[PDB]
Design a protein around this nucleic acid. Structure first.
Ligand code: ZN
Ligand code: ZN
Ligand code: ZN
Lengths: 117, 50, 1131, 100
DNA sequence: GATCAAGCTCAAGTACTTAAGCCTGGTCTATACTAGTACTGCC
């Protein structure tokens, strides 16, 4: 499914609101300021992920490997480059109760590989 | 404390004083014990009014 | 090259000694006042606007420079003379220096008639000077010069003298400014609130607080609003952005959300957009703001202008108040909304209000600067009104007569005298508690007071969160030193190596950042903010960067090289959020730490060598910091710092814990404060005990200062024979406790003897007391002056006489001299007269207003001093001396919270004794040890027995693995004693051995100012108050004890009604009134002429006597004053 | 109920109630003359408003919205209500519990 | 029989009262503008 992104007008750069062509019964994104219209391409106008199926690997960034306060381990090498050393940390993010899962990052420079056991 | 690492839930990091008074408390243990003492002092100085 | 573990214990303490030999103990106070005098005052003078006044001719009155001379005093003859602090303490003067400002008045009328007039060094006011500061006369003087000047070389300074009273400014805590803090209140209409107390870098002290909240989910979505200053109604963020000139919604999102690839962010910001879309122009948005503004929008034009200037001046002033900065304000408000969204989506943690990295300490510098700003504003106001009402008459005006120097002078004097921090009239907007009287009871008390902190949370608050010892107080504040009353956790004390930053200008840092690859905030495109790292300077978002790793490495190298970045500057690189917060603000509590590069310390052995020969090679702590071996780390950077407790942690272990340390502790005992550093083996006691000791060390007698014979203090306790503790911590050498000790090493025996020490009590040796054990002297100073307030009545010192004076008490006045002052060496008892003062009246023509001794004092006159006060009237100070021998009831306390009163005093013949003739000076009850867990007390007694038998000073440094109980026991077994300190004792009454071998040894005890002679009180029909005929309040007034409500309730439970009546009626305020039997109102009775009548009822026969308390009669009269008719119906 | 005690010197200091009654009598006399002689009634109005504020602040100073009756140093007066409001008052401070 | 008006009930918002006891010391106490009030040189 995936979320639904905002579409902006090309004249005033304002947000396009969803609307239907009553005669043709087709979804359009029309501007609430000027008279611009666009033919929708997703057909979905709203998506709310209540279960919050978020992959924290996307929130993690390679720069976290430069943190000296994080623990390092040699037992989990990096699969993308083979580097042995890697930092590991918890999610520590709200809305994630099962935060005891460990997320690893490769300490090698220019690799920044992220993964999870 | 800054002496520990992030996401450290070990007894020492979380304030488990493994030393006895006679043995002496390591500085971190001392600080955590001071925290607990603070808690007791506040409770004693607060309950009175109510 | 590397310091080996065996040499580390000496090297770290060498470094610590160099630190305290260079900085000192009150360095934060001295540096704050210095920075205030060099920078704050001059900046406030430049920051004041030139007052343009015109009838045509006009005048600008621009100030340009300041000059602060040394402290001086002008007598009535007017000759400027140098005033010493001792002279101020004696004459009750104010140790202040005059402030001379250069003024330029330009006259511009017409016809090219322009001319400048310069008034050099115009006396604008007096500023009180902090003792030992740069401008103090005691600056740079040697210890011998101070001794010649009758000053104590150990006196740290850091305090003012107002009317001869030593005042010390307590550092006030406040939430950091110019930083965004996203909190979440559980019970409120808002889920998350991102606030920002904004303030100009170095001006406009009022911190315009701006809130950006999110409406609670409970409506289509969650709306974002902003509580702007000077507006009493919340406003959606979109209107604010459009009012700033960003009308396109795409531009708004580009300023708020930096990553359009975050559909969660778009979905979270959508409700506010959909809620505020009808407005699409800047003028409409500004009109909306002006319509919501506190000021009424009489006209849309004014309304719009009102807003425009609010959004330009009040909203986020730290970002900029000039014009064309709407882009900067928009970016900052966007970042604020971004922070609110990150908190709402949970990707970021809420900010902790107790994190001291988020707090700032307002020291004397910023406090005096705030007062000076407000008072200089009031001065320019008075000068404006004066010049206006003179030019209105069409004539020139003299600025010398316009400048009311009394404003600044009396203002600073009043604030530092009373503590009400603010205008003299604004006694409610001002916060009290600042500028307390310096405690001079002992040197430790003085130091702690000069290193005291204050949290303005309010003692009435019952929330424990601000009182809790937060983790961030490590190394910055003493975990033990805190009051145990209603201010637990609120009043704190700095740690030994803690230094509060003074402040610095960020201009050089900004220039360095621009010189590197940073891009300014207006030059970049919002597309570049996604991956780039944000860079803040003092909370102002300046720009972005691409390689923050090497940027931080460079900034750190510069700070470690004392380059453009000074050591007090903080540099925290948040990695998860991709930001680099740089701080130069003042009040940032920080401490020094040893840099660790690989897993090895930069403090090599050559450094210890140079610090050992510190007196020859002039290699000091400053050179050690400049060598890049030490670094000042603040609480906010400790989050990003990985400390190594000791060099042992840097070694390779069987399992590597960190292996990536970046800093190291100089010594863990530095986490303790001043009154806690004196505790031996504090790591062997329960923390409450260490807190009680930190609170009593300030109450212990000793030698509060060397020139105590010169100081005429109101209350002073001096111990006859102070001794340095046999069991000493390595921090006392820096507290100078060895030079001004506050106790005596006592041969204490922990035993049950005659049960006269039970329930936390002690038995003293009468023979030791007879030999001067804990004997002390109490000095009390009485001050008085002759005021010539008016020709009707004048006061004068003169021996009163019965035939001329009227109000002469029955005490004899023969002890006085004809001058009216008693002479030294004279024996004086309670109610005796010491200053014979008479005031002329309008038994005739003069009333006695002499100064008597406080009741039940019984001292001897130590000395008498006579001088002239500021007004040139005669002023006398009489210091009376009373020798206090320790007796039953006096409080004594060890250094472990083991406090107690002397239960009884047994003679040396009656006290127990060892096989040798050693009786214990004190006997304490063993029951005081188990519950309190003061194992440090027993270890102190053991190390003390070993020190006394070995001829050395035991090292009781808190965290020292080189000294344990087994080593101490072995050393004690080497001198022919039981290894555990026990010893066979013999009953002093019978000589029989005691079945249980008692524990005995030297322990350092202290005598506390709480004697029984100063607390014993009694009353039997003494004086009473005036409003209600009830006993007075206090021993000084011979007052009675209060029979409170709880006592009334207890006697009710006992059912003793006669007793309750005696206590509440017959023993307090028995009274009689006459009431009318008809209306029950108090009638008019005249027992002399036996006539009783009620004017209301016109009757004079139906009157009745009623026995009621006077307070009851007064209550009924107070009700009749409120038109209530309480009718006492006796039938 | 309002004893005029002498301060540290000899000048007789008046009680807070005395000062408030003095203000009340000042505005009362002013209004009485302004009604005895035609004063346009505008001043009469304003006078009655000020008299009401004085009478109110005499028995109760903690008026919500209205300014607190001030005295020397800017301190609020101790109204009759504050004299027996709670702790340290007449009822709890001098009748239920008192010095003995 | 349907619609409108009046009355009753419920929910939300605003304002007012209380925050342990008793006990010991200390310090500090309105400017600010003003008119009159006397002095005192100046003539
Ligand atoms: Zn459009
Ligand atoms: Zn890798
Ligand atoms: Zn009657």
């Amino acid at each position: 499914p995936g979320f639904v992104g905002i579409r902006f007008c090309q004249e005033c750069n304002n947000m396009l609101y969803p609307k239907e062509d009553k005669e043709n019964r087709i979804l359009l994104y029309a501007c609430r300021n000027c008279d611009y219209q666009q033919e929708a391409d997703n057909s979905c106008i709203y998506v709310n992920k209540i279960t919050h199926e978020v992959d924290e690997l996307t929130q993690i960034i390679a720069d976290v490997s430069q943190d000296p306060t994080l623990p390092r381990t040699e037992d989990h090498p990096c699969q993308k480059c083979g580097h042995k050393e890697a930092v590991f940390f918890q999610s520590h993010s709200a809305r994630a109760e099962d935060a005891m899962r460990l997320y690893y990052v490769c300490t090698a420079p220019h690799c920044g590989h992220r993964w999870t056991e | 404390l800054p002496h520990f690492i992030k996401d450290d839930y070990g007894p020492e990091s979380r304030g488990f004083v493994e030393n006895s008074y006679l043995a002496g408390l390591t500085p971190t243990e001392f600080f955590f014990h001071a925290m607990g003492g603070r808690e007791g002092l506040i409770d004693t100085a607060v309950k009175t009014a109510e | 090259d590397e310091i080996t573990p065996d040499l580390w214990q000496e090297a770290c303490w060498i470094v610590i000694s160099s630190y305290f030999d260079e900085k000192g103990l009150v360095r934060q106070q001295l540096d704050s006042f210095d920075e205030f005098i060099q920078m704050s005052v001059q900046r406030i003078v430049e920051d004041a606007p030139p007052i343009d006044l015109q009838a045509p001719p006009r005048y600008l009155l621009k100030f340009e420079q300041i000059y602060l001379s040394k402290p001086t005093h002008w007598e009535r003859d007017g000759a400027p003379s140098p005033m010493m602090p001792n002279e101020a303490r004696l004459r009750n003067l104010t140790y202040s220096a005059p402030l001379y400002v250069d003024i330029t008045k330009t006259v511009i009328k017409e016809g090219e008639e322009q001319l400048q007039t310069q008034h050099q060094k115009t006396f604008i006011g007096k500023i009180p000077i902090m003792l030992r500061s740069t401008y103090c006369l005691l600056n740079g003087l040697t210890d011998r010069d101070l001794c010649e000047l009758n000053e104590c070389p150990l006196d740290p300074g850091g305090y003012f003298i107002i009317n001869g009273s030593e005042k010390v400014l307590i550092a006030q805590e406040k939430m950091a400014t110019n930083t965004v803090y996203v909190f979440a209140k559980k019970d409120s209409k808002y889920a998350y609130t991102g606030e920002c107390r904004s303030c100009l870098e170095n001006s406009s002290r009022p911190t315009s607080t701006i809130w950006v909240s999110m409406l609670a989910r409970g409506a289509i979505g969650q709306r974002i609003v902003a509580t702007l200053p000077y507006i009493k109604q919340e406003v959606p963020i979109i209107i604010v952005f459009r009012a700033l000139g960003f009308v396109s919604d795409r531009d708004i999102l580009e300023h708020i959300i930096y990553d359009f690839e975050d559909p969660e962010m778009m979905e979270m910001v959508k409700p506010s957009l959909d809620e505020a879309f009808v407005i699409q122009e800047q003028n409409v948005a500004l009109n909306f703001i002006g319509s919501r503004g506190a000021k009424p929008g009489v006209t849309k034009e004014k309304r719009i202008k009102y807003a425009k200037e609010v959004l330009q001046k009040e909203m986020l002033p730290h970002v900029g108040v000039s014009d064309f900065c709407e882009t900067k304000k928009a970016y900052f408000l966007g970042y604020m909304v971004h922070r609110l969204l990150l908190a709402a989506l949970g990707r970021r943690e809420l900010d902790d209000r107790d994190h001291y990295g988020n707090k700032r300490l307002d020291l004397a510098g910023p406090l005096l600067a705030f007062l000076f700003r407000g008072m200089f504003k009031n001065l320019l106001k008075e000068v404006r009104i004066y010049a206006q009402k003179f030019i209105d008459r069409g004539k020139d005006f003299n600025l010398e007569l316009a400048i009311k120097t009394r404003i600044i002078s009396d203002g600073l004097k009043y604030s530092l005298a009373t503590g009400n921090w603010g205008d003299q009239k604004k006694a409610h907007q001002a916060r009290a508690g600042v500028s307390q009287v310096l405690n001079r009871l002992t040197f430790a008390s003085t130091l702690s007071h000069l290193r005291r902190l204050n949290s303005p949370i309010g003692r009435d608050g019952k929330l424990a969160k601000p009182r809790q010892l937060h983790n961030t107080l490590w190394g910055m504040v003493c975990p033990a030193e805190t009051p145990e009353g209603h201010a637990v956790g609120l009043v704190k004390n700095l740690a030994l190596m803690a230094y509060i930053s003074v402040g610095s200008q960020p201009s050089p840092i900004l220039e360095f950042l621009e010189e590197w690859s940073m891009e300014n905030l207006e030059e970049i495109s919002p597309a570049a903010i996604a991956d780039a790292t944000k860079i803040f300077v003092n909370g102002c978002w300046v720009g972005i960067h691409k390689d923050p790793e090497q940027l931080m490495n460079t900034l750190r190298k510069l700070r470690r090289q004392m380059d453009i970045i000074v050591s007090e500057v903080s540099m925290i690189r948040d990695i998860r959020e991709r930001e680099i917060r740089i701080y130069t603000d003042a009040g940032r509590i920080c401490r020094p730490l040893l840099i660790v590069e690989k897993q090895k310390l930069l403090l090599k052995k050559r450094h210890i060598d140079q610090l050992k020969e510190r007196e020859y090679n002039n290699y000091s702590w400053q050179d050690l910091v400049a060598s890049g071996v030490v670094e000042y780390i603040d609480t906010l950077e400790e989050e990003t710092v990985m400390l190594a407790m000791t060099p042992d942690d840097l070694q390779e272990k069987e399992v590597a814990y960190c292996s990536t340390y970046t800093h190291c502790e100089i010594h863990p005992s530095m986490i303790l404060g001043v009154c806690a550093s004196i505790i031996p083996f504090p790591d062997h006691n329960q923390s409450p005990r260490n807190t009680y000791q930190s609170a009593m060390g300030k109450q212990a007698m000793g030698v509060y200062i060397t020139n105590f014979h010169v100081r005429m203090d109101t209350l002073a306790h001096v111990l006859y024979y102070p001794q340095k503790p046999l069991v000493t911590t390595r921090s006392m050498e820096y507290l100078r406790f060895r030079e001004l000790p506050a106790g005596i090493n006592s041969i204490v025996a922990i035993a049950s003897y005659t049960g006269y020490n039970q329930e936390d009590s002690v038995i003293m040796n009468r023979s030791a007391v007879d030999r001067g054990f804990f004997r002390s002297v109490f000095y009390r100073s009485y001050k008085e002056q002759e005021s010539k307030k008016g020709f009707d009545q004048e006061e004068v010192f003169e021996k009163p006489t019965r035939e001329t004076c009227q109000g002469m008490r029955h005490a004899i006045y023969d002890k006085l001299d004809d001058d009216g002052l008693i002479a030294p060496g004279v024996r004086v008892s309670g109610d005796d007269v010491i200053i014979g003062k008479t005031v002329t009246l309008p038994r005739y023509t003069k009333r006695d207003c002499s100064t008597f001794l406080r009741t039940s004092e019984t001292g001897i006159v130590d000395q008498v001093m006579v001088t002239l006060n500021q007004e040139g009237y005669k002023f006398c100070k009489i210091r009376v001396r009373s020798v206090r021998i320790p007796q039953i009831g006096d409080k004594f306390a060890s250094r472990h919270g083991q406090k107690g009163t002397c239960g009884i005093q047994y003679r040396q013949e009656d006290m127990p004794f060892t096989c040798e003739g050693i009786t214990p000076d004190i006997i304490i009850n063993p029951h005081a040890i188990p519950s309190r867990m003061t194992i440090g007390h027993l270890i102190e007694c053991l190390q003390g027995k070993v020190s006394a038998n070995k001829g050395e000073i035991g090292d009781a440094t808190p965290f020292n693995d080189a000294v344990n109980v087994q080593k101490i026991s072995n050393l004690l077994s080497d001198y022919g004693y039981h290894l555990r300190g026990n010893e066979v004792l013999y009953n002093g009454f019978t000589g029989r051995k005691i079945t249980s071998q008692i524990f005995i040894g030297p322990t350092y005890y202290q005598r506390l100012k709480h004697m029984v002679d100063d607390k014993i009180h009694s009353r039997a029909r003494g004086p009473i108050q005036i409003l209600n005929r009830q006993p007075m309040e206090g021993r000084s007034r011979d007052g009675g004890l209060r029979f409170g409500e709880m006592e009334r309730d207890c006697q009710i439970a006992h059912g003793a009604a006669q007793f309750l009546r005696e206590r509440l009626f017959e023993a307090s305020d028995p009274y009689q009134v006459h009431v009318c039997n008809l209306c029950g109102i108090m009638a008019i009775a005249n027992t002399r002429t036996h006539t009783y009548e009620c004017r209301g009822c016109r009757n004079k026969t139906q009157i009745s006597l009623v026995r009621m308390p006077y307070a009851c009669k007064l209550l009924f009269q107070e009700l009749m004053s409120m038109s209530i008719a309480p009718r006492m119906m006796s039938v | 109920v309002r004893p005029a005690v002498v301060m540290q010197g000899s000048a007789r200091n008046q009680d807070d109630l005395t000062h408030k009654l003095a203000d009340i009598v000042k505005i009362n006399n002013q209004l009485r003359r302004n009604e005895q002689n035609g004063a346009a009634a505008h001043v009469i109005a304003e006078d009655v408003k000020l008299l009401q504020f004085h009478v109110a602040t005499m028995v109760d100073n903690e008026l919500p919205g209205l300014p607190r009756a001030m005295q020397k140093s800017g301190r609020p007066l101790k109204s009759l209500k504050q004299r027996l409001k709670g702790k340290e008052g007449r009822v709890r401070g001098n009748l239920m519990g008192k010095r003995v």
